[PDB]
Amino acid sequence: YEDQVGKFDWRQQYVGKVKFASLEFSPGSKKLVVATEKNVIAALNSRTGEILWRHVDKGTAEGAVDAMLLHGQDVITVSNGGRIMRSWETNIGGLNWEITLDSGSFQALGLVGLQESVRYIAVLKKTTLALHHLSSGHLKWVEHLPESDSIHYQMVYSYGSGVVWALGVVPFSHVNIVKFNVEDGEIVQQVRVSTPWLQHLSGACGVVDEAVLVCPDPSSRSLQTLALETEWELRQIPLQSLDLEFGSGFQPRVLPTQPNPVDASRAQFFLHLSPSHYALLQYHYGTLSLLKNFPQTALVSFATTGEKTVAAVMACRNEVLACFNQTYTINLYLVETGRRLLDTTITFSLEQSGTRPERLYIQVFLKKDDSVGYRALVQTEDHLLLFLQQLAGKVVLWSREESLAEVVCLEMVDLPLTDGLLGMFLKRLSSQLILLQAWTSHLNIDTLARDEFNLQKMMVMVTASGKLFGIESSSGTILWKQYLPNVKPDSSFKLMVQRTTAHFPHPPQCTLLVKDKESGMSSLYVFNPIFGKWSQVAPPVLKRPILQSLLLPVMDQDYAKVLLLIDDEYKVTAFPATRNVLRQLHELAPSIFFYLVDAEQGRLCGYRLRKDLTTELSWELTIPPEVQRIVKVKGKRSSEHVHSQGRVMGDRSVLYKSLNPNLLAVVTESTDAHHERTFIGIFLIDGVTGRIIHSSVQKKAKGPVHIVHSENWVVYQYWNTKARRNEFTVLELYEGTEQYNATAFSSLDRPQLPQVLQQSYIFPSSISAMEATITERGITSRHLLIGLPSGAILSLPKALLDPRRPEIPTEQSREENLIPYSPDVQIHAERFINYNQTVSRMRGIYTAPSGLESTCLVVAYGLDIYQTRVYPSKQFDVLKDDYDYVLISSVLFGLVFATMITKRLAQVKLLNRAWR
Amino acid sequence: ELLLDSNIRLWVVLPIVIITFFVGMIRHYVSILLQSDKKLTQEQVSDSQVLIRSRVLRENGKYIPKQSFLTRKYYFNNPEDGFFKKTKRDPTMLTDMMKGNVTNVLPMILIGGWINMTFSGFVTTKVPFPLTLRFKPMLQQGIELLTLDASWVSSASWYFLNVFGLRSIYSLILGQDNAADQSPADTNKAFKTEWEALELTDHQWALDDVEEELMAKDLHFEGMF
Ligand SMILES: *[C@@H]1O[C@H](CO)[C@@H](O[C@@H]2O[C@H](CO)[C@@H](O)[C@H](O)[C@H]2NC(C)=O)[C@H](O)[C@H]1NC(C)=O
Ligand SMILES: *[C@@H]1O[C@H](CO)[C@@H](O)[C@H](O)[C@H]1NC(C)=O
């Protein structure tokens, strides 16, 4: 902290892919109300695209937004599958009323009107319908629709008539409609019609004009209609009479509108005949007419300026499916007549490739000349928000990358660098003249260079939407973006730095390993981590599903770290797998061991590496899934160092840490979820010989467990069900007073089981993410970056979590300066590495060693992404920011003159004394 | 190793050296400026010079024949002659001398303390030899590290080493036996001890054998030109 806000740290707030959006607002209100797939309800500034008020929710589906509506100035939302309905004041940025609802799967939501004004909400669940007041949310009336045990309701309609229309269908069979009254709610009427060809109502059918139901029928290429106000039998109109046809293997849709719930719907509506094809149809008393046909158009949208409806149609400049260049034009068409608006065409280009717009929400207003001026928020396929304004300059207003809401993996890449003695002297003196000339002469990804302290790196981020980003670690800006086509949401990623920027003759090179979960096939993408472009080195095609990957420290000739993959057939594939690489890893084969942790079966296997690139069953253990399921397999970071091999115990003696570099820390939960019988096991299984160093099982405890594994110790936070309190438990591994094998450490040559020191602390809050502070040489003290749900980042000193803290202080403890054991761990607000930059729904904390020895770079990723530096040792090796230059220089240059003056004084006094 | 900040050199290493150098010069110059000779009356200087003559006589009366020497002895320490017998006789000075003695080290320690406060929290230099771990609490004042090598030193001990290594330089440039470093009242007893010493002394006329030791070798004469 130290009140130097914004000097080094930066936070970016990211919401997820925009599931539901609302643009309709006052022209001066300049607000967007959006609920995303991340359970987040937020308000975006229309002008610049910034958060006004953001309300995240539970990450699980138990707070998922299911339906949004806007009325006047407050937005009404439904969450938890219709369980709760809330009203949010868009201006203040808070709730207005929160009401829980009854059981039953929600199917349709709508509003009702008495005579001219909407005042109640009609919410329909698969078995019932409910009315709630707008003023307070009080339930008006609940009616169980008849026969609903068989029908599935799909829509709700009401308008100024003071009645409620309910519609339900049964697949490939008859459908039913119910008339309720807003005043009471009783079943005013009920009708049923036969729809043998119908599948579902919401996706296919629609309702236009005066509640007239319209189902597009692709079986007969027609438009089945039912004048729902009066008609009791569906009518049919073929599209051939209107010169229209449906696509093959597609579900045509119908898009009506309703400028305000009180009035009836507009007669005109859209029909999605086939993909890249739309029609405008105007229903008028049993017959319909084609207003305008839009071929090769991706997305259409409707808007109302208050009196007239406006349709926005999206298509690229010239089709080449796909589109020639990602240049999409949106045109305005009046809804009263299928006529394109004048001077309203917008044209933009999508930066990425393989990405096409997915969602389009437009907001309209009256210009000075009464011309419909509109803006368009378009979400692409790769979860990117673009705000397009009509005026040509800056055709995009604010481009928001919501995709970065869900980051899977990220890495920090260093920036690029900025025989005879006579020959040596000649070149050295030449260099001297060159440097002298350079000094005397002193009288953006293009120029990217490494800092002096290496404190400014570049973060290569991977997003489950399959998107790769390059973000400057200092400013947080994006330097390069790439997209991976066809990446499933649940795919597993793995990013590896094959070659850093310290090899100027060779390009930097990183490898990302993705693995589709459903198929099992894994692929390797090699790219320059600085520029983001795929390397020309074609990665091998991983034919078989793979299980694990290793980044061997051995490097190819071009300083590319060898990467090994173990496939499903337990074979090993190398990369680059050249002759030199093949020889090196074939010659060093028996010293390479894989461990595969099958969590489903509770099995651990450890395989050797044969000379001929084959694996053999070296060791195998089985934790029975019937009583224990593996939940964490946290091993120690490979890229860390230990400064002090042993520790001073006082007494002028040393206690040796048990530095096992092949030590797993497999943490498993108890399959018994009872609050009194649950337990959490931690096994310190070795990674080579498979030996379980320790097999601790904490009783009466429950997950989730957040474990950090470091040089020697492990720290795993958990929940204690017996006392209902989050608890830590530090396990420190210590060897004897004298080291067993020094020169080198081998997991096959450790017959002495290391002693374990344990201690359980109480944490007075929850947790969201943990990660130890890592330094280049490990000299700087270790800190745990506790991630609280609140968003803060506690910097807990590891020295506090010592298990050797005695319960009663003694002379040995005082000599060693050991604090007496205190089961309570403080959450002092002064320890947070962030002040108020809370990272809502924190997902992980990345710690980078950086340069120097006191500064560790921190990137907390979750919904928001925040970056800073931490000084676990108070930045001991850097000049203080409050140095008194004007004092040191002043004393120096007021003391040199003092020295001169006092020398003169001494001379004068000596002369006078000599002469007397 | 450690990538130390370059600015630690330009603002914490060199300024310490400059400060030490010029503080030594200032201290020496202030010392010579402050020194004022105390007024001495005729009697004290007279008796000091008299005992000086007596002692130099005791030292080298060998180049004087025996009778002259024993006449000197009679004059100095002998009842009949009378000499050496009828020859005898918070305060500001203590505070002044105590302050003068104190100002040779205490200013250095105060400067060290001021530097320790001013330059607390740094790592100035790495001592190129492996110091013991037990010296850590004082070499690395202002550093929170635990596993840091003892060879890394804070500002205070670096200043101490600087002030330790500059006395020879002071003698080199300022002049020999400079005052920038770190480190008779009673005549009656003096009269009696001179009495006893010159009583104990004997005579050996060194000229008793000069001629014989001169006749042995010819007189040096070259270089007459
Ligand atoms: C809240 O966060 C902001 C942004 O990080 C902090 O920024 C400024 O801090 C200075 C501190 O003197 C204030 O004077 C400014 O008004 C802040 N700017 C804002 C709030 O926009 C701010 O300090 C943080 N506040 C707290 C209490 O941590
Ligand atoms: C489209 O054209 C623009 C302008 O030439 C160009 O910058 C862009 O890369 C092109 N392609 C895409 C996919 O946007």
Ligand SMILES: *[C@@H]1O[C@H](CO)[C@@H](O)[C@H](O)[C@H]1NC(C)=O
């Ligand atoms: C360690 O074990 C190896 C054998 O594995 C042995 O040769 C060596 O002497 C032992 N000690 C050290 C310090 O390496």
